[PDB]
Design an enzyme around this catalytic site. Structure first.
Site, PDB file in Angstrom:
ATOM      1  CG  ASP A  13      -2.086   0.872   1.108  1.00 47.45           C
ATOM      2  OD1 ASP A  13      -1.931   1.972   0.610  1.00 47.45           O
ATOM      3  OD2 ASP A  13      -3.182   0.486   1.527  1.00 47.45           O
ATOM      4  CG  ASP A  38      -1.035   4.335   2.602  1.00 51.02           C
ATOM      5  OD1 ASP A  38      -0.792   5.100   1.668  1.00 51.02           O
ATOM      6  OD2 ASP A  38      -2.053   4.427   3.307  1.00 51.02           O
ATOM      7  CB  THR A  40      -6.506   1.822  -0.293  1.00 52.05           C
ATOM      8  OG1 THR A  40      -5.365   2.512   0.161  1.00 52.05           O
ATOM      9  CG2 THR A  40      -6.212   0.337  -0.060  1.00 52.05           C
ATOM     10  CG  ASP A  48     -21.573   5.707 -22.291  1.00 55.05           C
ATOM     11  OD1 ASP A  48     -20.958   6.486 -23.059  1.00 55.05           O
ATOM     12  OD2 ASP A  48     -22.392   4.859 -22.707  1.00 55.05           O
ATOM     13  CG  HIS A 103      -2.249   4.866  -3.462  1.00 55.69           C
ATOM     14  ND1 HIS A 103      -1.431   5.357  -2.467  1.00 55.69           N
ATOM     15  CD2 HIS A 103      -3.167   4.086  -2.843  1.00 55.69           C
ATOM     16  CE1 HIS A 103      -1.866   4.926  -1.297  1.00 55.69           C
ATOM     17  NE2 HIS A 103      -2.927   4.160  -1.496  1.00 55.69           N
TER      18      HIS A 103
END
Ligand SMILES: *[C@@H]1O[C@H](CO)[C@@H](O[C@@H]2O[C@H](CO)[C@@H](O[C@@H]3O[C@H](CO)[C@@H](O)[C@H](O)[C@@H]3O)[C@H](O)[C@H]2NC(C)=O)[C@H](O)[C@H]1NC(C)=O
Ligand SMILES: CC(C)CCC[C@@H](C)[C@H]1CC[C@H]2[C@@H]3[C@H](O)C=C4C[C@@H](O)CC[C@]4(C)[C@H]3CC[C@]12C
Ligand SMILES: [Ca+2]
Ligand code: NA
Ligand code: NA
Ligand SMILES: [Zn+2]
Ligand SMILES: [Zn+2]
Length: 795
Positions: A116, A256, A154, A679, A304
């Site tokens: 993470d 993280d 996350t 869309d 990320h």
């Protein structure tokens, strides 16, 4: 009633019975003796020499006994300490040409090792901090970075990894969400998230089970120590053939948490990174003990990155909105706003957007209606995404009120093209390439590859299957170019001027008298050769369209939309920009190849007081005064708000020449996009909601361009032997420039910044147009798929 012989069992135990599995703590459902029998910590996680050949003591966290391989519970360093073996990291890099799996293994297992908040640049810390990870990276296949999905949080990213879908499609659009159909809220903490109603698409563990490939439980209650997560995967890998999973996942909450506490550049980041590498070492040593280190494919991947964000850099909505108590804000590194009460009659979302638009000179966020967000974010088509969105500047937060030295120094969630948000990818194992670097790619692409790695048919998803074939030593999926659906007409010069009643004008009667003598006017000639470098785009839906040739450009003219679907032209490095003469300023000419009934009319534009028109091939880049007349054909005209024309004209008159001058020529393909229902897909005729006053001329929601040149800039774009270089845009066709706070200034101070924000992949344009590009090149189809997924980030 007891977990004896059941710790981390894969068996599915339903309520009310007490559980012993990975997630029992998360559902507050473990048996009474779970925490003692299953979470053993005694004597730590490493064999020492004195323990070698011990009689098994069941209270120990792991074992150094002669039975420990049979029971699936040796400490990961058991053979190193007790049997003279070397740590995996100390072994030479050796190519793995085919899986080297033990008896009873029917396919190479896959282990996904998710970290993470592991920022891409953390890999720069290198072998002295992370020797195991550096070995995986250098010996296997790796990218410089992997791009996450927006928001860079996350849950959306972990579920995207699992499904190959954009958050708007899989449904997990944030760590926090409100669903107005459920009338319920989802949060990272609490029980609500466990309800299946929230989760769409088909994640990898379900794809596997449906196709007869056994999946381990991917998720781990936060109480389970990382060392135990690794030992549990190794224990499952020791199960008999009919119980053993083929796909596994490990998850770490680090780095993280340390990033949030200390920021990404803190010297405090070193220790968490060492600890993760230690866990990777335990896994690799553990695999080596089971003789699986040249059998398993391992993916090391993050969700990320992490940015410097402190409480001092917080914008407050209460400094812009007088009625902040009437709204709810999902705050932080992005903003989503909705009404606090549905019963409110005062809440006007137009007044909110207006009150947040360019109100302070250094404002560190920008409001958007979700349909106006950059199309590359694919962040609109879901009822859980609030109409009002705030794109927050990197390094900043947005909060509702000031009541909301700091406790935190890092955060993430920003625009997914931001450098600090990029994360990592390494693949290591028999199916991945050896010592291979690959370009950066998007995490939406990984689901297809993980399916390939397990012999699974992927569920429909947003990857471009084949775009990551270059990661793998052996591919089982071979992509094929889609068949063209609509075939074009090739109309000749057949009509006379006298047949047209379009209300168009060019008092002087400006005309190229020479056209009357030019029998070959508008024939193919070398037009296709010079201006369509990569073949004609294929139309992948049913429609009626014409190919139109000119000296300076070629187009695919839709007889349904009354405008080009695409216009293609090449501009050399040395090309000259010329002005539009006084007499041609308002000139529009009938196209004698196209009937009056399938042409636009200039009277519609006169009567529409809000709408003007532009051209797709720019008259500014004509090759001669003769050829410039072609650019004023009614078949080259497109509807444009005057505000948008400021953008378009700068692009056409200034930037195209700039690009040609920087890139040794460029080939440009431009055209309209219609996406009224946001869309990400080409609208049908019935979905188009606005036309030029009194006409059937539809109004585009956006205008695209794809700008291609030679990656080897020593070759001009029209004589390129090798790989291509591409940048593309999908510009919002808006009646104002409220997005651009500096728009009262000269276009040189704001237009390029707007365009960079609206950078796009060729694949994005393909979805939005139903066109298929690059059909005739010297490149393999897999290389073209990689090209089409490229995003020029400007970072
Ligand atoms: C991202 O990938 C997803 C999954 O493929 C795409 O969503 C899917 O889009 C299709 C096309 O709109 C939906 O199916 C359609 O259903 C209608 C019936 O109403 C039918 O006329 C069509 O023949 C087609 O079958 C589909 O339900 C939807 N699936 C999921 C799981 O969301 C999405 O479009 C992709 N996004 C982009 C931007 O490409
Ligand atoms: C508190 C954390 C440590 C753990 C949270 C994990 C949680 C997000 C997981 C646990 C169970 C998962 C669902 C389960 O695998 C079944 C399905 C079927 C699949 O078709 C759609 C997804 C879904 C509902 C899983 C979503 C994620 C869940 C709730
Ligand atoms: Ca659409
Ligand atoms: Na007008
Ligand atoms: Na403006
Ligand atoms: Zn995260
Ligand atoms: Zn975080």
């Amino acid at each position: 009633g007891s977990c004896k012989g059941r710790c981390f069992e894969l068996q599915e135990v339903g309520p009310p019975d007490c559980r012993c599995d990975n997630l029992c703590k998360s559902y507050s459902s473990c048996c009474h003796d779970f925490d003692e029998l299953c979470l053993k910590t005694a004597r730590g996680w490493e064999c020492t020499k004195d323990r070698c050949g011990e009689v098994r003591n069941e209270e120990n966290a792991c074992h150094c006994s002669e039975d420990c391989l049979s029971r699936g519970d040796c400490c990961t360093n058991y053979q190193v300490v007790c049997k003279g073996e070397s740590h995996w990291v100390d072994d030479d890099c050796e190519e793995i040409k085919v899986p080297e799996c033990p008896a009873g293994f029917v396919r190479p297992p896959l282990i996904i090792f998710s970290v993470d908040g592991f920022r891409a640049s953390y890999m720069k810390k290198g072998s002295k901090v992370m020797p195991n990870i550096e070995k995986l990276r250098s010996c296997g296949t790796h990218a410089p970075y992997m791009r996450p999905v927006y928001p860079t949080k996350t849950f959306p990213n972990l579920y995207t990894l699992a499904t190959g879908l954009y958050p708007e499609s899989h449904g997990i659009v944030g760590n926090s969400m409100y669903d107005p159909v459920f009338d319920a809220s989802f949060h990272l903490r609490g029980r609500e998230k466990f309800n299946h109603r929230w989760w769409g698409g088909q994640p990898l563990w379900i794809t596997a089970t449906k196709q007869g490939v056994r999946a381990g439980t991917f998720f781990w209650s936060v109480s389970i120590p990382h060392e135990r997560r690794i030992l549990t995967i190794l224990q499952w890998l020791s199960l008999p053939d009919n119980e053993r999973p083929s796909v596994y996942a490990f998850y770490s909450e680090q780095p993280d948490f340390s990033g949030h506490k200390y920021g990404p550049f803190g010297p405090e980041m070193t220790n968490p990174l060492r600890e993760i590498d230690k866990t990777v070492g335990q896994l690799m040593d553990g695999l080596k003990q089971l003789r699986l280190h040249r059998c398993v494919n391992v993916i090391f991947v993050g969700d990320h990155g992490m940015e410097d964000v402190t409480c001092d850099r917080t914008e407050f909505l209460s400094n812009y909105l007088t009625n902040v108590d009437d709204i709810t804000l999902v705050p932080g590194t992005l903003g989503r706003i909705r009404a606090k009460s549905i019963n409110n009659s005062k809440y006007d979302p137009k007044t909110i957007i207006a009150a947040l638009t360019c109100k302070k000179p250094d404002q560190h966020f920008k409001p958007y209606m979700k349909q106006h967000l950059p199309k590359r974010l694919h962040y609109a088509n879901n009822r859980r995404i609030e109409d009002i969105h705030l794109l927050v500047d990197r390094r900043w937060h947005v909060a509702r009120k000031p009541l909301d030295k700091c406790f935190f120094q890092g955060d993430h969630g920003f625009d997914n093209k931001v450098n600090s948000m990029q994360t990592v990818f390494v693949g290591y194992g028999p199916t991945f390439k050896y010592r291979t670097k690959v370009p950066p790619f998007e995490n939406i692409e990984l689901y297809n590859v993980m399916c390939d790695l397990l012999g699974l048919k992927p569920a429909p998803n947003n990857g471009t299957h084949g775009s990551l074939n270059h990661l793998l030593r052996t591919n089982t999926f071979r992509p094929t170019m889609p068949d063209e659906v609509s075939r074009p007409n090739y109309p000749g010069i057949m009509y006379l001027q006298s047949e047209f009643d379009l209300g168009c004008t060019c008092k002087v009667e400006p005309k190229n008298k020479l056209e009357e003598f030019n029998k070959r006017l508008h024939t193919k000639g070398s037009t296709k050769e010079r201006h369509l470098l990569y073949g004609r785009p294929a139309v992948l839906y049913r429609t009626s369209y014409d190919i139109l040739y000119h000296t300076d450009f070629e187009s695919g003219y839709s007889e349904i939309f009354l405008m080009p679907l695409w216009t293609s032209y090449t501009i050399s490095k040395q090309a000259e920009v010329s002005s539009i003469p006084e007499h041609l300023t308002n000139c529009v000419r009938p196209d004698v190849r196209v009937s009056p009934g399938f042409s636009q009319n200039c009277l519609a534009y006169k009567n529409d007081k809000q709408m003007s028109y532009g051209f797709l091939f720019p008259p500014y880049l004509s090759s001669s005064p003769e050829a410039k007349y072609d650019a004023f054909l009614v078949t080259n005209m497109v509807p444009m708000y005057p505000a948008f024309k400021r953008v378009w004209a700068y692009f056409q008159r200034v930037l195209v020449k700039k690009y040609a001058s920087e890139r040794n020529g460029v080939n440009v393909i431009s055209g309209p996009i219609f996406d009224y229902n946001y869309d990400g897909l080409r609208d049908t005729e019935d979905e188009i909601k606005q036309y030029v006053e009194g006409s059937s001329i539809p109004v585009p929601t956006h205008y695209y361009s794809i700008i291609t040149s030679c990656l080897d800039f020593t070759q001009p774009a029209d004589k390129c032997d090798g790989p291509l270089s591409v940048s593309s845009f999908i510009l919002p066709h808006r009646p104002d420039n409220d997005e651009s706070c500096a728009s009262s200034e000269d276009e040189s101070k704001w237009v390029e910044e707007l365009m960079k924000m609206h950078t796009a992949r060729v694949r994005d344009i393909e979805h939005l147009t139903g066109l298929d590009f690059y059909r005739k090149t010297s490149r393999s189809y897999s290389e073209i798929l990689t090209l089409k997924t490229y995003l020029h980030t400007y970072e």
